[model samples]
Target: EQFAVGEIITDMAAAAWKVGLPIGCIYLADMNSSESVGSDAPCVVKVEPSDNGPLFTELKFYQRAAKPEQIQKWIRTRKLKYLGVPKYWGSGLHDKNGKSYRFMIMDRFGSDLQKIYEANAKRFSRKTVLQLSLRILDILEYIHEHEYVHGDIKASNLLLNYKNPDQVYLVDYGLAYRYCPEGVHKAYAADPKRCHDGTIEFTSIDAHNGVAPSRRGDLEILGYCMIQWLTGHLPWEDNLKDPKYVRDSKIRYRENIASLMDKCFPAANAPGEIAKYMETVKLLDYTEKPLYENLRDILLQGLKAIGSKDDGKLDL
Candidate 1:
């Protein structure tokens, strides 16, 4: 519950005492490992080495899940971002409450996507939205090929690489689960305990039924994000404080597609491609994969319908 931006902290929680490292040092090995934060407010520090002023020692956080090395390799790689993923400065072992807190450091983002969306009155231009969709979907495709399912894919989890603003990086892999191994798929189920396991309004039906999120669920979440980005709000926005109402709204929108398109998309008689995308994913078998290229084509085409160039390239 206790942390300071410029002071190195101990695992004492509120009884934190600063170590004599550097003014920018974030956390230290002054306490037992059991006292570390599970998830809470991040520790921010303006470290010793950057000409860029401060390297966020937000530098994000993660866990050592089963076979985390593989996924960690994916996040650390700079192979593809519009350019690539954020620079993961790497990991370290810090003691907290007599346990080891394995910290993975990455670039602290300038601002999350949600911040920008709100700055723009919660709505984004169609061109920007589709471009971001292209980038985010490309990442989802990459990670799925690696056999990981992003159980939570929302605006707050998406980051724009500050240096290469055209690039969009999908982050916060906390809820991610390995649904398959190579060609083998995970067993699908509708368990009671895990139902309604994600952000209420945008979570997939499979999630609402306690089934593990898969490639289908990842895309489904993105579909909801797309709608919210385009229209400034979803049909279910008003009812979101009530989880059942939000879940019911998702199913309702899924079953009666036009009811949503009529409200979210502009002009009547419009097919509402984004809504259609959601409906298509909802119909997909739980274990199915998305047709990445086909979907992006229409996404690219939407740039024009909304008055932007349709070269399928993002203007960084």
Candidate 2:
């Protein structure tokens, strides 16, 4: 559904150790202006097969636009600890005038859950959603322990690895931040200038207050994603155009989660694990360290209660 004019940028290359990539150069303007791109809008992404492992999806970015650290967000997250995050392939460059870009590659994933949810008139089965919640908890706890909060954790970013479907991959780290150092946790402080920094509808109250993302924020966002998966939309999704409206709605939901969850999702089932998890996520202090093992066990306990298999890997 692409229209207008588009041009090939350049065939990006890795380091000197390699010759050229088996990729073609295709470029398009970043169209995030008031003119919102619809379903038919042209896609600006590229997918290519690699010499090793499964085929990869490559996201191109300019050094001038995307910060050096942002470019390596995936690599950094992967190097910090494995699992959850995509395995970084390597990036290539083309020019210095910011003309050339890098082909940052990661494992290709299965059907985007967001698309699937939106296109179909159905809801995720209770058992399947529980498995998803448990698997996500495992990965989130790992990163949170290592001082990283996946500032962005939405359905669009949570993809099922095509290689092994049970294991989900949480991609995108552009909004990721160091909520804590090796041992020092960033205190919750509202910075008026920093407010409204994450995806509307799901961004935590902490994020709305301009506080750096914390473990609580990750859990909160996770709560929203889970709710959306079980149902179709969040109460604030339709009012996304107004930042204050969305933020206020989220705050009300955050404060009255049980009642809200019950009203929003008749079941919110999966043996009520989603509800339980959100409750825990809401009560967490910004500086509190999440109990990784205990949280995982809670999901596992729910799995047993719901008559589902916990195949260690959570394979679909």
Each candidate: RMSD: 9.0, 9.9
Error of 2 at 167 (Å): 2.3
All candidates' TM-scores? 0.71, 0.68
Question: Quick one: best TM-score, which candidate?
Answer: 1
- Please report how far candidate 2 places residue 282 from its true position, in Å: 2.3
Q: Worst 10-residue stretch by lDDT in candidate 1?
A: 49-58
The TM-score obtained by model 1 is: 0.71
Tens digits of per-residue lDDT for model 2, 1-316:
1122332333344221112122223222222344433333322333222321211211321222233354356436645322555544344443434343334433445656676656665466556666777767766775666566767777788876665556676766544665666678877775443333788778888887777878878878877877777676688878899988988888887787777776676565334666677777776788987776666666677778867667644433
Model 1 C-alpha RMSD vs. true structure (Å) is 9.0
Q: Name the lDDT of candidate 2.
A: 0.58
Following a full C-alpha superposition, what root-mean-square deviation does model 2 have from the true structure? 9.9
Candidate 2 clashes: the total is 2
Question: Candidate 1 lDDT, tens digit per residue, 1-316?
Answer: 1223234443322334232222224433232233443222222222233322112212322222222354455656734434233443344445544544434334444457888788888887667778888777777776777677777777788876654566677775544566776678878875442333778878887787777778888888888888888777888788777877777877887888778788677767553567657666767787788788777776766766777764545442
lDDT of 1 at 313: 51
lDDT score for residue 100 of model 2:
32
